[PDB]
Each structure stands twice: as C-alpha cells, then as structure tokens.
Amino acid sequence: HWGYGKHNGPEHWHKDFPIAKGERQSPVDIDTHTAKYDPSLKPLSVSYDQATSLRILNNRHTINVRFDDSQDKAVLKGGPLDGTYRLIQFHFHWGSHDGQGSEHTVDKKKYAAELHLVHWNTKYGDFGKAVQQPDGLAVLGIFLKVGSALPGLQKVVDVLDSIKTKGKSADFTNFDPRGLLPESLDYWTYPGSLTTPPLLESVTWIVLKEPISVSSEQVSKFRKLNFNGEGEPEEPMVDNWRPTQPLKNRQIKASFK
Ligand SMILES: [Zn+2]
C-alpha cells in the first residue's frame, strides 16, 4: 500500500496511479513574483459558523476531522469557484522537523505544516461523485508557521494521543474550524489534484498567503503519531507530504494586487 516511505512513497505512486505524471498535479511551487492578480476573481466566502464536527481519525496517512455535510452548514464559495462547496473534512501534512512539512511551497520556501480543508461541489450530490469531476472539489490550503501557540488548534493536539495508531478514531464534536483561519483571506489559486492517491485532477486549490502560527510544542505532538497499527513496528507519522510537481501549462492567479 502507498505511503511516504522509501518503498511506497511519492516516487512509486505512478505505478498504481499513472495520473501521478498528469498535466494538473498538486502540490506546486508558488512563485510570488509571477503569479498574476486576477480581477475577475469574485470575493472569497468562507462560511463555517454552523460547521458540525463529528469525529477525528488516524487513517495511516494523516489525521482527519470529518464534518456533517448533509446540508449547507459549512461552505466555501466565491473566489474562483462557481456554485457552492460543502466542507467534508480537514487534515494536515507535516515534517520530521520544523524546516519542512508543507506541500505547497512559496518561492521554494517550505513551512512546518499545511492544513487542507476539503470541500465538494453540491451539484454532484456527494463527495464520492464529486471527486470524479474536474470541478468537483475545492481545497483551502493554509500554511503553519512556527511561532506562538494557536489556541484554535489546541483541541486537536489534545486528542492526538487517543488516535496514535492507524485505524484509531474518536468523537470530536463542537470543534469550530474558524479557529484555524488567519486574519487575511488573500490567496493564490490554480487547478490541480489530490496530493495523495488516487491523485485525481478534481481540485480547485485556494492557498492562503497568510500562515497561521503554531508552537514548536504543538507541531511536535503531531510527530508522535504513528503510521503503523497497534503493536506493529513503530513508524512515526512524519514527512507525510508530497513534493511539488511541475506547473506545466497552468496559471497561478493571485487574489490580491
Ligand atoms: Zn490508504
């Protein structure tokens, strides 16, 4: 099974998922000098006040917080998007040390971690239909930068010990994801893919320019998660990021002048 090891990591994925070498792959390097302000982008609308978190899960690849997506309780709209995208889940990618971890880079700089809030196009009816379509998904990407602790994250770090090994999950109600947004919604956007298998080219990426701040101590708790299941050889869940892929014939737009 795919993973982030020497034998099953990003360099291997193409053998089971040949779209790994496709024309709209993610993540990418964002070159801030050449991404152009686009005036046709509408205002971005992140509306998460009625979000209903359900459960948190270690799936052997990351930790993910799943939400009730039965109605428009948490949606992303505007910016490059047409129509309404419902929030389904958020997860993270992070490194074995604070100098790497993010999937997107900005002028080749890596952050300590990246948060991905995953939304699907309500016109396709559910996540599983949506993920098969070019305009099916929208992922809001937010960098984590080492500094002051973020209170908004502390409820996640606090439960990590209960989901240390793969397959483990826990109740995770009343978590408000607005606590994971920076002040600014300035963003870059480009058409891309899922950054994990099956690497489907169904994602409009919206990557916020402003990182949220997390402490060294908070990121370290992520590093005590495990890829392995209970009682197998330990394998710390670190460096669960895919390297940047070639932009090819795509445009990164900026939302801001
Ligand atoms: Zn898997």
CA distance 130 to 179: 27
Contact between 92 and 116 under an 8 Å Cβ cutoff? The reply is yes
From the CA of 61, how far away is ligand 1's center (Å)? 7
Among 1, 7, 12, 61, the active-site one is: 61
Structure tokens at 33: 């000098």
Instruction: State the amino acid at position 41 in one-letter form.
Output: L
| Residue among 105, 62, 113 at smallest CA distance from 252 | 105
91 is in an annotated binding site: yes
Structure tokens at 171: 């109740």
CA distance 113 to 212: 10
| Residue among 143, 249, 124 at smallest CA distance from 206 | 143
Residues in the chain, total = 257
| Residue whose structure tokens are 């209903």 | 52
12 is catalytic: no
Contact between 77 and 45 under an 8 Å Cβ cutoff? The reply is yes
Cis link prior to 182 (omega < 30° from 0)? Answer: no
CA distance 241 to 9: 10
From the CA of 197, how far away is ligand 1's center (Å)? 8
The dihedral over CA atoms of 250, 120, 178, 108, expressed in degrees to the nearest 10, equals -20
Give the CA angle between residues 95, 68, 131 to the nearest 5°.
Answer: 65
CA distance 182 to 211: 6
CA distance 117 to 240: 16
Over 163-189, what HEC string results? HCCCCCEEECCCCCHHHHCCCCCCEEE
DSSP-derived 3-state class of residue 123: helix
Structure tokens at 221: 């708790």
Domains, the chain = 13-254 (3.10.200.10)
| Residue among 95, 100, 96, 194 at smallest CA distance from 141 | 194
Kindly provide the residue ranges of all beta strands, DSSP E only, lying in 180-239, ordered along the sequence: 187-192, 203-208, 212-214
